Short mmCIF file of N, CA, C and O in Angstrom, two decimals:
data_model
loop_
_atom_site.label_atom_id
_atom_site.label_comp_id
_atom_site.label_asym_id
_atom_site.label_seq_id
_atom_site.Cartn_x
_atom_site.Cartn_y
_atom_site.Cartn_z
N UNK B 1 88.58 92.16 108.12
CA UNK B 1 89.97 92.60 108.28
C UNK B 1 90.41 93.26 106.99
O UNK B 1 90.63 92.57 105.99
N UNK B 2 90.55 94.45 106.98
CA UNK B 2 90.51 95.35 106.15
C UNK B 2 92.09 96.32 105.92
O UNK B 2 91.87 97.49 106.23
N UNK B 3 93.35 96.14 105.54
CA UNK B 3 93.08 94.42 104.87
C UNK B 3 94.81 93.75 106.06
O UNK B 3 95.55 94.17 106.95
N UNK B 4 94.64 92.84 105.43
CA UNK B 4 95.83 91.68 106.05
C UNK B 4 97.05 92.09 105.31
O UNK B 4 98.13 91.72 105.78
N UNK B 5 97.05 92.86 104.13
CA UNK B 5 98.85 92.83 103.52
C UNK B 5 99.16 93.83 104.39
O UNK B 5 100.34 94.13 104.24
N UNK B 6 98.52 94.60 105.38
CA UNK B 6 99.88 95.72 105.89
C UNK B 6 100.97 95.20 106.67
O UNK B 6 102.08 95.71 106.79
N UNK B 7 100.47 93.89 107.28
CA UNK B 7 101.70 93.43 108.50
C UNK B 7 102.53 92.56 107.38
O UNK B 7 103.71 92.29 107.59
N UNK B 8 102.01 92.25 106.44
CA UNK B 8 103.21 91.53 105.34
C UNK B 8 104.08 92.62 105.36
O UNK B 8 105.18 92.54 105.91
N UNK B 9 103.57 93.88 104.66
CA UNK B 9 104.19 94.95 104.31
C UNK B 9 105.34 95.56 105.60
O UNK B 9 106.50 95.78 105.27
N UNK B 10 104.90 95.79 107.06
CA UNK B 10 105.52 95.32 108.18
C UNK B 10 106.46 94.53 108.27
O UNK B 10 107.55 94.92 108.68
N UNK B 11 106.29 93.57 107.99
CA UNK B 11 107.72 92.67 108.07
C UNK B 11 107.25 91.32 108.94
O UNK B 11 106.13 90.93 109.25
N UNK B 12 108.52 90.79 109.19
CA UNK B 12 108.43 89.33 110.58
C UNK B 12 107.55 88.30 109.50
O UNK B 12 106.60 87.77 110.09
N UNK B 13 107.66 87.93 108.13
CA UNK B 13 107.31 86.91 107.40
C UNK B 13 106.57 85.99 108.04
O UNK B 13 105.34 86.11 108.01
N UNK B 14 107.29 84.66 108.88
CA UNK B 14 106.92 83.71 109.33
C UNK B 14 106.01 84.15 110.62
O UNK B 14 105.27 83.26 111.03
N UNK B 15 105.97 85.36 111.28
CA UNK B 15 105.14 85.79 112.27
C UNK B 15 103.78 86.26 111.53
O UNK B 15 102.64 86.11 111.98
N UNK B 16 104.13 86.82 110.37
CA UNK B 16 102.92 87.29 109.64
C UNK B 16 101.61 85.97 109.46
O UNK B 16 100.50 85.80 109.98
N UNK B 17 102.48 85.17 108.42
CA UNK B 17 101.36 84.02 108.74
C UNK B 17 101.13 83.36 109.54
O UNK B 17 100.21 82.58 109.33
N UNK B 18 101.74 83.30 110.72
CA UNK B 18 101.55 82.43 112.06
C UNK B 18 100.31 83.52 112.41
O UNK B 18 99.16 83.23 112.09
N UNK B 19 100.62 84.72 113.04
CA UNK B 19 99.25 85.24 113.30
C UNK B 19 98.02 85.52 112.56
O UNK B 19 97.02 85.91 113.17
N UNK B 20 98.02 85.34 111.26
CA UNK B 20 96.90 85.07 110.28
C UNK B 20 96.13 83.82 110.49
O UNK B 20 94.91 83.62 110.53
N UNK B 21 97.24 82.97 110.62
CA UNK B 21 96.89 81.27 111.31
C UNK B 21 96.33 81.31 112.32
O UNK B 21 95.17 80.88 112.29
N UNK B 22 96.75 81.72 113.39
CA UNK B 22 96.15 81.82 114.49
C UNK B 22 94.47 82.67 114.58
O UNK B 22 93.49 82.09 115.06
N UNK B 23 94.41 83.95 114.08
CA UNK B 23 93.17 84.64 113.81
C UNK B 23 92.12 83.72 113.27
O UNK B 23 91.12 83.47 113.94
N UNK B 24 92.32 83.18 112.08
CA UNK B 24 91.85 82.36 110.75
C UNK B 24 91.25 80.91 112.13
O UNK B 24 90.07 80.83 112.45
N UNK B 25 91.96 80.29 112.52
CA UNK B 25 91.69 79.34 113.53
C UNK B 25 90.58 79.90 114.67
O UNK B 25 89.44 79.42 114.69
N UNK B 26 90.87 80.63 115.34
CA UNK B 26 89.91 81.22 116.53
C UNK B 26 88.21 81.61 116.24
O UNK B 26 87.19 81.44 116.90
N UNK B 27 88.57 82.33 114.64
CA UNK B 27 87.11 82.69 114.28
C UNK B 27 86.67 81.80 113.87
O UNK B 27 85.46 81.82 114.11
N UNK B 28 87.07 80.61 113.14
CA UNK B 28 86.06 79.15 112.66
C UNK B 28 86.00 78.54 113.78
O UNK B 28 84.92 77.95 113.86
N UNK B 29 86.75 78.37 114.83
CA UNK B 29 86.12 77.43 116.26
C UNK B 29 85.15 78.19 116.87
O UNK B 29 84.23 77.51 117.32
N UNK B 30 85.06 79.61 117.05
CA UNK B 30 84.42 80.26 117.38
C UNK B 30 82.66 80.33 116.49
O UNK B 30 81.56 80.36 117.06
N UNK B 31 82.93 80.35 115.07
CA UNK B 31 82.42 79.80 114.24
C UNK B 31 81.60 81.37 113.52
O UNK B 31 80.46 81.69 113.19
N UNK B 32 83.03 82.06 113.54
CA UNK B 32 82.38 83.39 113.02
C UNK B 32 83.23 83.47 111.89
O UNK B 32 84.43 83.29 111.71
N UNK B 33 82.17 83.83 111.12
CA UNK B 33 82.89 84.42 109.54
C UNK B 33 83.44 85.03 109.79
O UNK B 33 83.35 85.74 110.79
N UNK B 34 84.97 85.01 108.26
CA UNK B 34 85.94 86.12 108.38
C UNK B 34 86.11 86.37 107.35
O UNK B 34 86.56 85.51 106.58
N UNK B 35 85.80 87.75 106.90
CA UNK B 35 86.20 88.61 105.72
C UNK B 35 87.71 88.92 105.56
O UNK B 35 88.29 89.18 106.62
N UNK B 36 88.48 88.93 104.36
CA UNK B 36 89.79 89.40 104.71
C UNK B 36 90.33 89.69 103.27
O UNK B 36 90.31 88.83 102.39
N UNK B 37 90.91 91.24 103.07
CA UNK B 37 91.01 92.20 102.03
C UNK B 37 92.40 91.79 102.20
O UNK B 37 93.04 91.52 103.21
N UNK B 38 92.82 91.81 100.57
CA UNK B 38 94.44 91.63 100.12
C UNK B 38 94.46 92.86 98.89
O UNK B 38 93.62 93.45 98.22
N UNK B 39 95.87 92.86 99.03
CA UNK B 39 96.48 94.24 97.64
C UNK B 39 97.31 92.67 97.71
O UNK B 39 97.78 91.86 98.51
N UNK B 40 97.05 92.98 95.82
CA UNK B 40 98.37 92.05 95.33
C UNK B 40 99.13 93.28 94.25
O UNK B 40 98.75 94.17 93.49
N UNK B 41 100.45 92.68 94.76
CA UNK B 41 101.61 94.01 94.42
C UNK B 41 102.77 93.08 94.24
O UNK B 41 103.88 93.53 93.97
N UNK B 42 105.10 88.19 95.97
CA UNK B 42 104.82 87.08 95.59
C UNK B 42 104.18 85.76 96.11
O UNK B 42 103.88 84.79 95.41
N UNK B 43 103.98 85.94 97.74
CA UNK B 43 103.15 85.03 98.43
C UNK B 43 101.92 85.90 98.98
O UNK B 43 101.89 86.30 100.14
N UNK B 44 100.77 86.18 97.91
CA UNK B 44 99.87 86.13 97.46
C UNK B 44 99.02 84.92 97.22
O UNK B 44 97.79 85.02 97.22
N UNK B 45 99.85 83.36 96.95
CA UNK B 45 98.96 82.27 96.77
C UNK B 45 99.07 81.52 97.94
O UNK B 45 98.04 81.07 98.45
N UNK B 46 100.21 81.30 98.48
CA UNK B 46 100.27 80.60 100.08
C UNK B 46 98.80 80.79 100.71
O UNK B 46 98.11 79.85 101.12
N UNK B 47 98.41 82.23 100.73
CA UNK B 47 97.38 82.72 101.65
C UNK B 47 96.06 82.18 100.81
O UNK B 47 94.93 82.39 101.25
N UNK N 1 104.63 116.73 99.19
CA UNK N 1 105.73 115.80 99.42
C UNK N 1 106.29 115.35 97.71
O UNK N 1 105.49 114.83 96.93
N UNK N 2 107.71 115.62 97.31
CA UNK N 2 107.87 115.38 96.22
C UNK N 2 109.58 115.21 96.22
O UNK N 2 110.35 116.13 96.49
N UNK N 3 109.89 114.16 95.94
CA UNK N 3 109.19 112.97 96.15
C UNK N 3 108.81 111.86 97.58
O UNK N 3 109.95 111.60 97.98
N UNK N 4 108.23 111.42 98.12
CA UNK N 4 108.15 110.05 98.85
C UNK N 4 109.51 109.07 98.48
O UNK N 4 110.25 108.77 99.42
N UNK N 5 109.75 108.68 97.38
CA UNK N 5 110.32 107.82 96.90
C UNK N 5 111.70 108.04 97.61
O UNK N 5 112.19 107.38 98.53
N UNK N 6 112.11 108.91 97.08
CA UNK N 6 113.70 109.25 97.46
C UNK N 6 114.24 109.13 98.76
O UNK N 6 115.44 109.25 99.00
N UNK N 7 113.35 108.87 99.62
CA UNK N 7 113.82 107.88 101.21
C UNK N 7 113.72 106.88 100.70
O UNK N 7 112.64 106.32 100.54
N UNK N 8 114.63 106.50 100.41
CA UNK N 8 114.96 105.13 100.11
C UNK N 8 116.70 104.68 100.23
O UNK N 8 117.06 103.53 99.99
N UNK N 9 113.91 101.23 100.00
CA UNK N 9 114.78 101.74 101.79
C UNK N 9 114.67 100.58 102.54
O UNK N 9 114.32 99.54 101.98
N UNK N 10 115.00 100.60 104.09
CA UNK N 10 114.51 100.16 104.70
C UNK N 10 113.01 100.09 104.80
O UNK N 10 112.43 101.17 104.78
N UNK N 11 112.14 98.79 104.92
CA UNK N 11 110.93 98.52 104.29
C UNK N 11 109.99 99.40 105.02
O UNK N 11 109.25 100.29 104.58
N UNK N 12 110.28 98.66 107.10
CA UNK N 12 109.48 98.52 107.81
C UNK N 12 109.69 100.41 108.12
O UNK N 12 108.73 101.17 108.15
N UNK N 13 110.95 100.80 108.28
CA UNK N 13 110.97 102.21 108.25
C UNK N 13 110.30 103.07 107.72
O UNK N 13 109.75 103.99 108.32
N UNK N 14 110.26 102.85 106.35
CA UNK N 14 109.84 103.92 105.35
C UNK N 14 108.88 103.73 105.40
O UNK N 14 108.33 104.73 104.95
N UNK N 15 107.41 102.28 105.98
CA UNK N 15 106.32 102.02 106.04
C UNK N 15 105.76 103.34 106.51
O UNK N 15 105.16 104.23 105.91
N UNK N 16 106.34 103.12 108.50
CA UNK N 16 106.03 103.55 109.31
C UNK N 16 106.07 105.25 109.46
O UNK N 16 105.22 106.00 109.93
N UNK N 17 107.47 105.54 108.83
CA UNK N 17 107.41 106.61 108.52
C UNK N 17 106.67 107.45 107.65
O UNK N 17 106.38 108.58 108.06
N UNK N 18 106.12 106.90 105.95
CA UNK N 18 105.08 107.20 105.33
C UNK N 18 103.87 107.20 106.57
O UNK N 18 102.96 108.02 106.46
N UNK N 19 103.87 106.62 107.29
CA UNK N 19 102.38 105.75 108.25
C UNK N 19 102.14 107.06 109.21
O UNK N 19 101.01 107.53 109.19
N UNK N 20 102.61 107.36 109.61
CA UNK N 20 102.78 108.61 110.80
C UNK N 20 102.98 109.74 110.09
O UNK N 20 102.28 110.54 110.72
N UNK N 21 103.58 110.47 109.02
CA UNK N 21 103.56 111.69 108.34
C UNK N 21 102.04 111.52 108.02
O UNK N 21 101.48 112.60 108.21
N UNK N 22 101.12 110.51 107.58
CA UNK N 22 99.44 110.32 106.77
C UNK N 22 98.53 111.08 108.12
O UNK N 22 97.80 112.08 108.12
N UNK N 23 98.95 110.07 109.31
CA UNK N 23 98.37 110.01 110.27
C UNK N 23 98.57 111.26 110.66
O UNK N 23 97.44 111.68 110.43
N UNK N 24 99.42 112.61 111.27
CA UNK N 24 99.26 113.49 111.50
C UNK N 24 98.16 114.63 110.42
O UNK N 24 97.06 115.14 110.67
N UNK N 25 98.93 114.68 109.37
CA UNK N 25 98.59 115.39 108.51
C UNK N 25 96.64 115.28 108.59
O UNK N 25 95.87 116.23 108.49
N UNK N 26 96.36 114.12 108.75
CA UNK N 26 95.11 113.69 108.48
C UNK N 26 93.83 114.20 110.07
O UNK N 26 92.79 114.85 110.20
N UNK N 27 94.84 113.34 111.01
CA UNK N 27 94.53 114.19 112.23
C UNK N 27 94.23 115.54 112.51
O UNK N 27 93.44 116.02 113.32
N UNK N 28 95.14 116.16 111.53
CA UNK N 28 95.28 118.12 111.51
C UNK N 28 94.06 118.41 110.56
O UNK N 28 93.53 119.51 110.49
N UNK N 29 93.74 117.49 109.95
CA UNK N 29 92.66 117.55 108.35
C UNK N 29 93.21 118.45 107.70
O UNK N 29 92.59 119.45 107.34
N UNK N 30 94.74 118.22 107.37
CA UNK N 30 94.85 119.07 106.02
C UNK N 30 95.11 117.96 104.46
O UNK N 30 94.98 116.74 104.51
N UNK N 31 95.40 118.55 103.45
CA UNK N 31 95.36 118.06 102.33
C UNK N 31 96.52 117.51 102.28
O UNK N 31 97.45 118.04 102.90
N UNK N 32 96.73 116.19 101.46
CA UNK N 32 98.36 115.81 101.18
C UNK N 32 98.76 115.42 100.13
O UNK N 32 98.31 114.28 100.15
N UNK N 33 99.58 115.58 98.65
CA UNK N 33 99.84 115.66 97.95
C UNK N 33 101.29 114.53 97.77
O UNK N 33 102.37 115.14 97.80
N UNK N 34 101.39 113.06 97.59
CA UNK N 34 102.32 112.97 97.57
C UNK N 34 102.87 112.14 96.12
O UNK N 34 102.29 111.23 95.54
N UNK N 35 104.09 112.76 95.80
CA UNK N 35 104.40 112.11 94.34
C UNK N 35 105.48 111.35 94.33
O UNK N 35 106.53 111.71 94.85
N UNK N 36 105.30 110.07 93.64
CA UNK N 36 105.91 108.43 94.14
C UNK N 36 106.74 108.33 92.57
O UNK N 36 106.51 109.10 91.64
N UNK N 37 107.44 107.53 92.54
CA UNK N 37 108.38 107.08 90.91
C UNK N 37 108.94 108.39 90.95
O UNK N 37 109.72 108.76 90.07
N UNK N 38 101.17 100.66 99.10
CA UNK N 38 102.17 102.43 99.27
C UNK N 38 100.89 102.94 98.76
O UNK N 38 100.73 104.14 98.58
#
């Protein structure tokens, strides 16, 4: 996922990490690695 | 484009709007030049 800050950048905060949560969840039950690219430019450490 | 900046802004606007001026321009394959002070 190349990368994850655009929907930060997008907007909807609490939707942002709910669907990161949700993605992040599906591929480890599934049990597939997940790559995931950040720009740091302040919740940068949450993630 | 000189400047980008000076729409200023609304976040998700000015995203989308930067987002779709890239996307055409790029579609057309021409060159784009844009100066900022994303």
């Amino acid at each position: 996922l190349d990368p994850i800050s655009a929907f930060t950048e997008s907007g909807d905060r609490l939707e942002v990490q709910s669907m990161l949560l949700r993605i992040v969840d599906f591929l480890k039950n599934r049990g597939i690695t997940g790559i995931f690219t950040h720009l740091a430019h302040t919740t940068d450490a949450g993630l």
